[PDB]
Write an enzyme that holds these catalytic residues in place. Structure first.
Site, PDB file in Angstrom:
ATOM      1  N   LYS A  10      82.056  20.997  30.976  1.00  0.00           N
ATOM      2  CA  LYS A  10      83.014  19.802  31.328  1.00  0.00           C
ATOM      3  C   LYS A  10      83.150  20.081  32.788  1.00  0.00           C
ATOM      4  CE  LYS A  10      85.033  16.145  29.404  1.00  0.00           C
ATOM      5  NZ  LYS A  10      84.629  15.524  28.490  1.00  0.00           N
TER       6      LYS A  10
HETATM    7  N1  LIG Z   1      84.898   8.156  28.183  1.00  0.00           N
HETATM    8  C1  LIG Z   1      84.253   8.752  27.274  1.00  0.00           C
HETATM    9  O1  LIG Z   1      82.950   8.523  27.068  1.00  0.00           O
HETATM   10  C2  LIG Z   1      85.016   9.619  26.150  1.00  0.00           C
HETATM   11  C3  LIG Z   1      84.410  10.159  25.165  1.00  0.00           C
HETATM   12  C4  LIG Z   1      85.068  10.805  24.204  1.00  0.00           C
HETATM   13  C5  LIG Z   1      86.247  11.246  24.363  1.00  0.00           C
HETATM   14  N2  LIG Z   1      87.041  10.712  25.473  1.00  0.00           N
HETATM   15  C6  LIG Z   1      88.456  11.178  25.421  1.00  0.00           C
HETATM   16  O2  LIG Z   1      89.260   9.935  25.447  1.00  0.00           O
HETATM   17  C7  LIG Z   1      90.300  10.010  26.293  1.00  0.00           C
HETATM   18  C8  LIG Z   1      90.726   8.841  27.138  1.00  0.00           C
HETATM   19  O3  LIG Z   1      89.414   9.003  28.167  1.00  0.00           O
HETATM   20  P1  LIG Z   1      89.036   7.636  28.640  1.00  0.00           P
HETATM   21  O4  LIG Z   1      87.518   7.483  29.226  1.00  0.00           O
HETATM   22  O5  LIG Z   1      89.536   6.199  27.978  1.00  0.00           O
HETATM   23  O6  LIG Z   1      89.968   7.566  30.060  1.00  0.00           O
HETATM   24  P2  LIG Z   1      90.296   6.379  31.125  1.00  0.00           P
HETATM   25  O7  LIG Z   1      90.484   6.923  32.501  1.00  0.00           O
HETATM   26  O8  LIG Z   1      89.492   5.277  31.324  1.00  0.00           O
HETATM   27  O9  LIG Z   1      91.765   5.814  30.496  1.00  0.00           O
HETATM   28  C9  LIG Z   1      92.825   6.837  30.238  1.00  0.00           C
HETATM   29  C10 LIG Z   1      93.820   5.742  29.601  1.00  0.00           C
HETATM   30  O10 LIG Z   1      94.912   6.645  29.074  1.00  0.00           O
HETATM   31  C11 LIG Z   1      96.170   6.113  29.681  1.00  0.00           C
HETATM   32  N3  LIG Z   1      97.165   7.350  29.792  1.00  0.00           N
HETATM   33  C12 LIG Z   1      97.139   8.219  30.679  1.00  0.00           C
HETATM   34  N4  LIG Z   1      98.013   9.086  30.933  1.00  0.00           N
HETATM   35  C13 LIG Z   1      98.932   8.681  29.567  1.00  0.00           C
HETATM   36  C14 LIG Z   1      99.969   8.678  28.879  1.00  0.00           C
HETATM   37  N5  LIG Z   1     100.882   9.990  29.322  1.00  0.00           N
HETATM   38  N6  LIG Z   1     100.536   8.244  27.880  1.00  0.00           N
HETATM   39  C15 LIG Z   1      99.766   7.001  27.693  1.00  0.00           C
HETATM   40  N7  LIG Z   1      98.602   6.615  28.187  1.00  0.00           N
HETATM   41  C16 LIG Z   1      98.142   7.327  29.148  1.00  0.00           C
HETATM   42  C17 LIG Z   1      95.701   5.493  31.034  1.00  0.00           C
HETATM   43  O11 LIG Z   1      96.759   4.711  31.562  1.00  0.00           O
HETATM   44  C18 LIG Z   1      94.372   4.786  30.459  1.00  0.00           C
HETATM   45  O12 LIG Z   1      94.863   3.614  29.563  1.00  0.00           O
HETATM   46  C19 LIG Z   1      90.437  11.437  26.774  1.00  0.00           C
HETATM   47  O13 LIG Z   1      90.915  12.511  26.035  1.00  0.00           O
HETATM   48  C20 LIG Z   1      88.669  11.643  27.171  1.00  0.00           C
HETATM   49  O14 LIG Z   1      88.628  12.907  27.366  1.00  0.00           O
HETATM   50  C21 LIG Z   1      86.453  10.111  26.483  1.00  0.00           C
HETATM   51  N1  LIG Z   2      83.783  12.152  27.736  1.00  0.00           N
HETATM   52  C1  LIG Z   2      82.933  13.096  27.150  1.00  0.00           C
HETATM   53  O1  LIG Z   2      82.689  13.867  27.934  1.00  0.00           O
HETATM   54  C2  LIG Z   2      81.662  12.419  27.067  1.00  0.00           C
HETATM   55  C3  LIG Z   2      80.398  12.941  27.849  1.00  0.00           C
HETATM   56  C4  LIG Z   2      79.061  12.301  27.706  1.00  0.00           C
HETATM   57  O2  LIG Z   2      78.961  11.116  27.233  1.00  0.00           O
HETATM   58  O3  LIG Z   2      78.064  13.175  27.607  1.00  0.00           O
HETATM   59  C5  LIG Z   2      83.273  13.713  25.840  1.00  0.00           C
HETATM   60  O4  LIG Z   2      84.575  14.075  25.749  1.00  0.00           O
HETATM   61  O5  LIG Z   2      82.597  13.521  24.949  1.00  0.00           O
END
Ligand SMILES: NC(=O)c1ccc[n+]([C@@H]2O[C@H](COP(=O)([O-])OP(=O)(O)OC[C@H]3O[C@@H](n4cnc5c(N)ncnc54)[C@H](O)[C@@H]3O)[C@@H](O)[C@H]2O)c1
Ligand SMILES: N[C@](O)(CCC(=O)O)C(=O)O
Ligand SMILES: NC(=O)c1ccc[n+]([C@@H]2O[C@H](COP(=O)([O-])OP(=O)(O)OC[C@H]3O[C@@H](n4cnc5c(N)ncnc54)[C@H](O)[C@@H]3O)[C@@H](O)[C@H]2O)c1
Ligand SMILES: NC(=O)c1ccc[n+]([C@@H]2O[C@H](COP(=O)([O-])OP(=O)(O)OC[C@H]3O[C@@H](n4cnc5c(N)ncnc54)[C@H](O)[C@@H]3O)[C@@H](O)[C@H]2O)c1
Ligand SMILES: NC(=O)c1ccc[n+]([C@@H]2O[C@H](COP(=O)([O-])OP(=O)(O)OC[C@H]3O[C@@H](n4cnc5c(N)ncnc54)[C@H](O)[C@@H]3O)[C@@H](O)[C@H]2O)c1
Ligand SMILES: N[C@](O)(CCC(=O)O)C(=O)O
Ligand SMILES: N[C@](O)(CCC(=O)O)C(=O)O
Ligand SMILES: N[C@](O)(CCC(=O)O)C(=O)O
Ligand SMILES: [Ca+2]
Ligand SMILES: [Ca+2]
Ligand SMILES: [Ca+2]
Ligand SMILES: [Ca+2]
Ligand code: NA
Lengths: 412, 412, 412, 412
Positions: free
Chosen positions: D103
Site C-alpha cells: 500500500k
Molecule cells: N477504490 C477502491 O478500489 C477500493 C477498494 C477496496 C476498498 N477501498 C476502501 O474504501 C474506502 C473508500 O475508498 P474510495 O475509493 O471510495 O475513496 P474516495 O476518495 O473515492 O471517496 C471517499 C468517500 O468517503 C467520504 N468520507 C471521507 N471522510 C469521511 C468521514 N469522516 N465521514 C464520512 N464520509 C467520509 C468522502 O467524502 C467520499 O465520499 C477506503 O477505506 C478504501 O481504502 C477502496
Molecule cells: N483500493 C485497494 O487498494 C485496491 C487496490 C487494487 O485494485 O489493486 C484496496 O484497498 O483493495
C-alpha cells in the site's frame, strides 16, 4: 534520556534560526530522502529462525553519495537511526567531504549471535538493501557492534549482485581493500580536534586529565592517542565495568590487558570503579565514546570536567548543553570531533575508486589537514554568529548542504 | 609433455602442503570460479564458415577483478587454459596487485587467418563473452598469438555493449589508451627479475651467456634488455628456426632483420641452428619464452644452463624441476619472473579508470619496484619454509589468496 | 556403457547424413552455444565445507529460450550434461515448442545431504548461474534427483537478483505458479506417445504387458497411466530392488506402498526379482525410466520386448539400436516419447507469462494435441527418408533447428 | 479510535492462534518485506514549495507481485499504510489471485492542490518509488483521494524510466489500458458478497434497509448496485453531510444530483441528517465505505444494524467486533467483501499482458465467480474452526500466504 530525534531536531532548528534559513527549505532538509525498513530473517546454527528489522535511513544526498555506518545494538530503533543519519549529513559537510548522510542498524545483540549467525544476518541485510545502496549512492561502514569483518561480508554479498565493488563499503579489512589508518581514524581524529581546541587556550593534551566512557573502536584509539600525547587518562569504563587511577592509567598496559580478554575492573594498574560514576568523575576533559544521550538534565549538573569532547554520536542533549554552558563547560561537538572516521572512509573510497592504496602517513596527514581546516572554519562561524562550538559546526554543515540543495533545484 | 593441468595441480598440491592448508580450503581454491566455453563461428573472406571454440576460465577473484591474457594457438584446450588461469591467480598475488586470475583463448593458428578474419573472430569472441568480463570483473590482455591490435578489437566490440570501456582490456595500443612500457614490460620484467636473482650471487647479466626459446613479444624485449646490459645472447629460436653465435648475437641487428621479415636462420650475424637443440644449448642461462611443458623428464637431464628464467608460462614440469634440482640448476619461476606484463597491465588499468596516463619512466620505475619487492618477499618466504624459489613464490601467492578467501567467508 | 556424448554424437552424425546437411552447418550445430562450469561450495549443517562443480550446458538457442532440467546425481559429468543438453535441442524441436536446448547438473548424491544442505546447494548454484539463465534466455526444470521443491528454491533465489520471475523455472509447486498436470506430464505423455504408436498396429495399451526400469517422477506416473488404461505392468525396478507379477501388479497399491516408505522388493502384491534382470524381463513393452545407456551391446541381445518406449533420456546406445533392429524390436525414441515433460513445462511458462493458470483438463488436452501432431510428423519423416523411428524424430528436430539457424545467419 | 496497526495486528494474532502457526513463522509474516518513506517536494503553481512524505509499504510477496492502492488523505501515516498493506496480503489470498500485499500514500489533502499540483506531486512520488514497483514486483492502484487520472500520471512518469508499462498500475482510464468494470468493481463486489451472505439466511438484498457511510468510488457504486437489486437505502453520508429517507432514497436520482455538484444535504428526495448519526442509524445493514476504525468501543453498543458489510478497509476494530458479536450482529469482513476492486485489478493486469480487453460482462461474471468461490471457502473455514466470518477469511488468507512462504524456504 531525551528522544534522540527530538534532541537532534532541536539542534537543527537552533542552527536553522541562526542561519535564517527559509522555513520551506528547512522542512525539506529535515525530511529524509528515503527511509528503508526491511525484514532480516536467518536460520540460527540449529536451524531455528530468528527475525529482525534492518534499517537504512538515507537522510540527504545533495552533496554526494550518502555515507554512514551500520549499528548492531539492541536499542537500535527508527528514531535513533534517523538522528544518526541526519548527523551524518551535517558531519560530512563540516569536514567538507563530498558525501551526504545515511545510517543503518539492526536491533540485535552481537554477543548473543555466533559468528556464522552474524555473517548470515549481515548477508541477508545486504541482500535486502543491495538495490538501494552503491558506490555513488550510499556507502556504509562500521559503527557500534560492527567491525571490518562485518564490512567484508557486506562487500562479498553485495558483489554477487553488482560485481566486485570495493568502494561500496568502507572500514574494510586491509587485505580486502581497506585503508591503512581507518581503524584508528576516529580516535586519532578526536585527538587532532582536541589539540586544535586546546591550542586556542594555550594548552596541550599533556596539561590535562581525561575520563573516557566506552572502550571499543573509538575509545581504545582515543585513549591510546591521548596517552601518547602525554595526557593523563584517569578513568575508563565500558559496558562491563571501569577502572580509575588519579595518577594516570598506563593505557599501553590497559590495551594489552584488554587484548588478553581482561576486564577493566581487574586491571592491576588502577582501582576498580563503578561505571555509573564515569561521567561525573573528577577530570579536566570528559570523552564519551559509547552511547548517545548520556549527558542529560539528570546528570549534567554533576559533571566536573571543563571540556567535553564528543567522540560518541550525540552524547549530550540540548538540556544538558544549557546546564553545562552555565557551568562554564566547553563542548566540542560530535559532528566535528568524531568526523575522523568518515573522513578516512572518504579516503578509503578514493583509494578503491583509483585502484591504488595510500600509505598510513599520507592518510593521517590528510586527516589532519581536513580536521584543521574544519576547526578553522568552525572558529570563523562562531565569530560570525557569536555562537557556541556546536552551533559553529552545525551551521557550517547545514549551510553547505543548503547551498548544494538550492543549486540542484526543485522542478521535476 | 605432461598434461599442463596435472603439472600445475602437482605444484599447487606441493605449495598447499608447505602452508599446511586445510583440505577443504585447498579443494575450493583449486576449483575455478567459472569455466566458460563458447562457439565462435565466422564467415571467412570467401564467405565459407569456420567454427572455433573459445575459452574464458575465471579461476579466482578473491583478491579483485580477474586478470589474464587471451591466447590464439592451435594447442589451446581446456586443460591448458585452466592451468594458465590458475597460474594468473598466484602470479597476481606474488606481485601483490589487486587482481585475481583468469585466462582465455581460441584453438586456431593466426598465421592461417587473414587480418579481416582475425578481426571477425576476435569480435565474435567478444560478443560471446562480453557479459562475463568487465572493468571490475575480468580484464583480458594479450598472450601468444594476440597483440595490441587484437585488444583494440576487443575494446571496440565490447564498447558497443557497455559504452567506452578502456579498462576492460589491457595491452591496448597507445592511441587507444594503452600504457607506455606495456609492450616491453614482460621481457623487461624478466630482466629485472634476473638481475635481482643474480645479485644474490654477486653476479650481473654481463657475466653470463643466454639462450632464448621463442622470439615474439616476450623473447624480443627480453633479448633486447639483456643485450643492453652486456649479456651475451648466444642462441635464439622461434617456430621457424634458430641462430647462434657463441660470441653473442648482435640483438639490435637481429631485431632489425626480424622487422624486415627476415628469418632467424638467415641472419648473417650468426650460424643457423636446429631449433630442437635450443633447450640443451651450452649457456649459463636458459630463458624459455614460448610454449609450456618444454622442459620435461625426457630432456631435463640434458640442460646445460645453471639458471633457468621462466619467461614463458609453465615451461618446466614437476618431473623436470626435480631432475634439474639434482643437477644444481636454479629456476626462477614463471609466477614471479614473467609477472612484469600483468604488473604493467595493472598500471594501464589504473591509468584508464583514473582517466589520466603516466610517462614511461614512471611505468618502468614502478615495474622495477614491484618486481624487487616480490623477489625480496620470495627470498624471505624461502627462508621461512626452507624451500626452492618456485615454492617460495607459489606459497607467497597462495597464502595471500587464502587470506582473502577466508576473510570473505562462506555463507550464502 | 558407452560414453553418453559419443553415443549421442553418433546419432547426430547419422541424422545429419540422412538430411545431407552441409558440413559447416553440421559442425556449428554440434558445438554448444555455451558450456558453464561453476564452483558450488556450501557450509554443511555442522559448519564444515563441501565443494561441488555445477554445470549448465546451453547447447542451442536458434528456436527460442533454452530449456532443460537440472540433475542431482553422482554420475553427472560434462559428457552426460552435454549429451542431455543436445537431446533437449532436438526434443523441443520434435514437439515444435519455441525453445532450444540446455541441461544442468551437480555430481552429488541427494540422499547424503540434509534438506537444508540441498537448499543451500541449490541456492548457491542459482547464485552462480543467475546471470546466464532467464525467462527468455534459459529456463530450468527438474530431472533426476530434483523436484518441485528444488525449483521453488531456484525461483526464490533467482528473484533476489532479478525480481519475481515465475517463468524462470518450470516444474514449480502449484502454489508458486506451477502448472496443473506438470508432475504427471512425462509419464502421461509417454502413454500418449505409446498409444499413437500402437494404433498403427491396431493395438491398445490394454493388449500389452509392460516392464518399467525406475520408479520416480517418470516411472510412477507412467506406470499409473498404463495401469489405468488396462495395461498389465508385470515388473518394476528402482535403485534398491524390483517386483514382478505376471498377472499385472496392482499399481495403485504399489504406489500407496511406496508413499509409505516401502521398498519394491517388499511389496506383498508381487514377487521380488533382481533389478539387474529388469531390462531382459519377458514383456511386450519395456519402458526404461531411469539412467541413460542401460541398453548396450552386452545386454541388447537378450531383450525380450517387442517395443521399447524411451521415457528416460538416451537409455539405448547406438550399438544396442542396431542389435535391437535386427531382432525386430521397435524403439520409440526419447526425443519424442518423453517430451511430455518439456511440453507441459512450455505450458507452465506460457501460463506464468500470461499471468493466469489453466485447468488440468486443458493442459492434458493440449499435451495430447502436441504429442499427436509430433507422431504424425515423425511418421511422415520416416516415410520421406525411409528410416527408423529414432531417425525420423531426430532428423525432424535437427532439420527444424537447422532451418532456424540458417534464417538467423552468420554475419557479426 | 484504536490505532489501525494495533487493531489489525490483534486480528492477525487471533487468526494465527486459530491456525496454530509457529511463533517464528508468525513473526516473519507480520514484518513487512520492505517499508519505504520518501520526501515528495514540489513547486506550487505560484512557485512556492510544499513538502510531503510519501509511503510505499511492501508487506508480503510470497504469493506474487505485490498489490494495493495509493491513498491521498491528510491522515495517512506509517501505521495506517502498514495496516492497509497487511490487509492487502490477506485479501489477495482470500480471493486467491496471484498477488501479495502493499500500500502507498501521501499525507496531503487533494482539495488543497490544483490539478497541475496534483500531477506534479504524483509524478514526483513516482520518481521516488519507480525503482520499487513494476509489473511483476508491485502494482499500485487507486484508493481514497486518487483516481484513474492519478494512475495515468503514474503510468506516464514510470514509463519514462522503464518504457511503456501499462501493467505497472491498475485502475487506469479505459483509454490508456484500463479495464471495463474496474471503476464499479469494488461496489459491485460488495453487493456480490452481500448477496452470498444473505442467501445463507434465505434472504436477499431486496429484503433489507441499508445505511452507507461514504459516497465516493466505493460508496456510489455500492449504493447503485444495492439499489438496482431492490435494496432500500435509507441513509447515506459523506464528509460534508448526510441524507435519510426511511422509505428508501432514490439512488439513481441521488447520483445525478451528486454529478451535478449537489451535496447529499440538499437532495430533495431525502431529509438532511447529521452524518455523525450515520453509523447508529435504524437500518438492517450498515455499509462503511469511508475511513477505518469508525466502529470502536465508544459506539458499537449503539449500532442498530444486524449486518455490517465492510466495504471500507478495517472499519471495525476488535473491541467492536466483540461488542457486536454479543449483540447478535454479523460482520462480513473487509478482506472478503471489498476484494472486488483488487480482483478486477488482477483482470486489468491480465488484459494488459494479454494485449486485448475484455467486455464488461466477462469482467463482471468472472468477478462474481471469484467472489462466490471465496465465500464458499470462508464458510468451510468457519465450520472447520468454529470461528466468525472475519477469522474464516483471515485464516483462509493467512494460511495461503503461510503455505507459499514455507515452500520458498529460508536459507540465504
Ligand atoms: N477504490 C477502491 O478500489 C477500493 C477498494 C477496496 C476498498 N477501498 C476502501 O474504501 C474506502 C473508500 O475508498 P474510495 O475509493 O471510495 O475513496 P474516495 O476518495 O473515492 O471517496 C471517499 C468517500 O468517503 C467520504 N468520507 C471521507 N471522510 C469521511 C468521514 N469522516 N465521514 C464520512 N464520509 C467520509 C468522502 O467524502 C467520499 O465520499 C477506503 O477505506 C478504501 O481504502 C477502496
Ligand atoms: N483500493 C485497494 O487498494 C485496491 C487496490 C487494487 O485494485 O489493486 C484496496 O484497498 O483493495
Ligand atoms: N567507529 C567509528 O568509525 C565511529 C565514528 C564516529 C563515531 N562513532 C561513535 O562512537 C561510539 C562508539 O562506537 P564504537 O565504534 O567505538 O563501538 P564499539 O562497538 O567498537 O564499542 C562500543 C564500546 O562502548 C561500550 N559501551 C556500550 N554500552 C555502554 C554503556 N552503557 N556504558 C559504557 N560503555 C558502554 C562497549 O562496551 C564498548 O567498549 C558510538 O556513538 C558511535 O556511533 C563511531
Ligand atoms: N605477452 C605477455 O605479456 C606475456 C606475459 C607473461 C608471460 N607470457 C608467456 O610468454 C610466452 C610467449 O608469449 P608471447 O607474448 O611472446 O607470444 P608471441 O605470440 O608474441 O610470440 C611467440 C613466440 O614463440 C615462438 N614459438 C612458438 N612455438 C614455438 C616452438 N615450438 N618453438 C620455438 N618457438 C616457438 C613464436 O615463433 C614466437 O617467436 C607464452 O608462454 C606466454 O603465455 C606472455
Ligand atoms: N522428470 C521429467 O520431467 C523428465 C522428463 C523427461 C525425461 N526424464 C528422464 O527420465 C529419467 C528418470 O527421471 P525422473 O525425473 O523420474 O528421476 P527421479 O529422480 O524422480 O527418479 C529416478 C528413479 O530412477 C531410479 N534409479 C536410479 N538409478 C537406478 C538404477 N541404477 N537402476 C534402476 N533404477 C534406478 C531411482 O531409484 C528412482 O526410482 C531420466 O533419464 C530423466 O532424465 C525426466
Ligand atoms: N560510525 C560512522 O558512521 C562512520 C561512518 C563512515 O566511516 O562512513 C560515524 O558515526 O561517523
Ligand atoms: N600474458 C599474461 O596473461 C599477461 C596478462 C595481463 O597482462 O593482464 C600472463 O601470462 O601474465
Ligand atoms: N527433465 C527434462 O529436462 C524436462 C525439461 C523441462 O521440463 O523443461 C527432460 O529431460 O526433458
Ligand atoms: Ca530532505
Ligand atoms: Ca575456487
Ligand atoms: Ca552451435
Ligand atoms: Ca514478512
Ligand atoms: Na548447524
Amino acid at each position: 534520556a531525551m528522544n534522540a530525534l527530538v534532541a537532534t531536531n532541536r539542534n537543527f532548528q537552533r542552527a536553522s534560526r541562526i542561519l535564517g534559513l527559509d522555513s520551506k527549505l528547512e522542512k525539506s532538509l529535515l525530511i529524509p530522502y528515503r527511509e528503508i525498513k526491511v525484514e532480516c530473517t536467518i536460520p540460527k546454527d540449529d536451524g531455528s529462525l530468528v527475525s529482525y528489522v534492518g534499517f537504512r535511513i538515507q537522510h540527504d544526498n545533495a552533496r554526494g553519495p550518502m555515507k554512514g555506518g551500520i549499528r548492531y545494538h539492541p536499542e537500535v530503533d527508527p528514531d535513533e537511526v534517523n538522528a544518526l543519519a541526519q548527523l551524518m549529513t551535517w558531519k560530512t559537510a563540516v569536514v567538507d567531504i563530498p558525501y551526504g548522510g545515511a545510517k543503518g542498524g539492526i536491533g540485535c545483540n552481537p554477543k548473543d549471535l555466533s559468528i556464522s549467525e552474524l555473517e548470515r544476518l549481515t548477508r541477508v541485510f545486504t541482500q535486502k538493501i543491495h538495490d538501494l545502496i552503491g558506490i555513488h549512492r550510499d556507502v556504509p561502514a562500521p559503527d557500534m557492534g560492527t567491525n571490518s569483518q562485518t564490512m567484508a561480508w557486506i562487500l562479498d554479498e553485495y558483489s554477487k549482485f553488482h560485481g566486485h565493488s570495493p568502494a561500496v563499503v568502507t572500514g574494510k579489512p586491509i587485505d580486502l581493500g581497506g585503508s591503512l589508518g581507518r581503524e584508528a581514524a576516529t580516535g586519532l581524529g578526536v585527538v587532532f580536534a582536541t589539540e586544535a581546541l586546546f591550542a586556542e587556550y594555550g594548552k596541550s593534551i599533556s596539561d590535562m586529565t581525561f575520563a573516557i566512557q566506552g572502550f571499543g573502536n573509538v575509545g581504545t584509539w582515543a585513549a591510546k592517542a591521548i596517552f601518547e600525547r602525554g595526557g593523563k587518562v584517569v578513568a575508563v569504563s565500558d559496558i562491563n565495568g571501569a577502572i580509575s587511577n588519579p595518577n594516570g592509567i598506563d593505557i599501553a598496559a590497559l590495551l594489552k590487558h584488554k587484548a588478553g580478554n581482561g576486564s577493566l575492573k581487574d586491571f592491576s594498574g588502577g582501582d576498580a570503579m563503578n561505571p555509573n560514576d564515569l561521567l561525573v568523575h573528577d577530570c579536566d576533559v570528559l570523552i564519551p565514546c559509547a552511547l548517545g544521550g548520556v549527558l542529560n538534565k539528570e546528570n549534567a549538573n554533576d559533571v566536573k570536567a571543563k571540556f567535553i569532547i564528543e567522540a560518541a554520536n550525540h552524547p549530550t542533549d540540548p538540556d544538558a548543553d544549557e546546564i553545562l554552558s552555565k557551568k562554564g563547560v566547553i563542548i566540542l561537538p560530535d559532528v566535528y570531533a568524531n568526523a575522523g572516521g568518515v573522513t578516512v572512509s572518504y579516503f578509503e573510497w578514493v583509494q578503491n575508486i583509483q585502484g591504488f592504496m595510500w600509505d598510513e602517513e599520507k592518510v593521517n596527514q590528510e586527516l589532519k589537514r581536513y580536521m584543521t581546516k574544519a576547526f578553522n572554519d568552525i572558529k570563523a562561524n562562531c565569530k560570525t554568529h557569536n555562537c557556541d562550538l556546536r552551533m559553529g559546526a552545525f551551521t557550517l554543515g547545514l549551510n553547505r548542504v543548503a547551498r548544494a540543495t538550492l543549486l540542484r533545484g526543485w522542478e521535476a
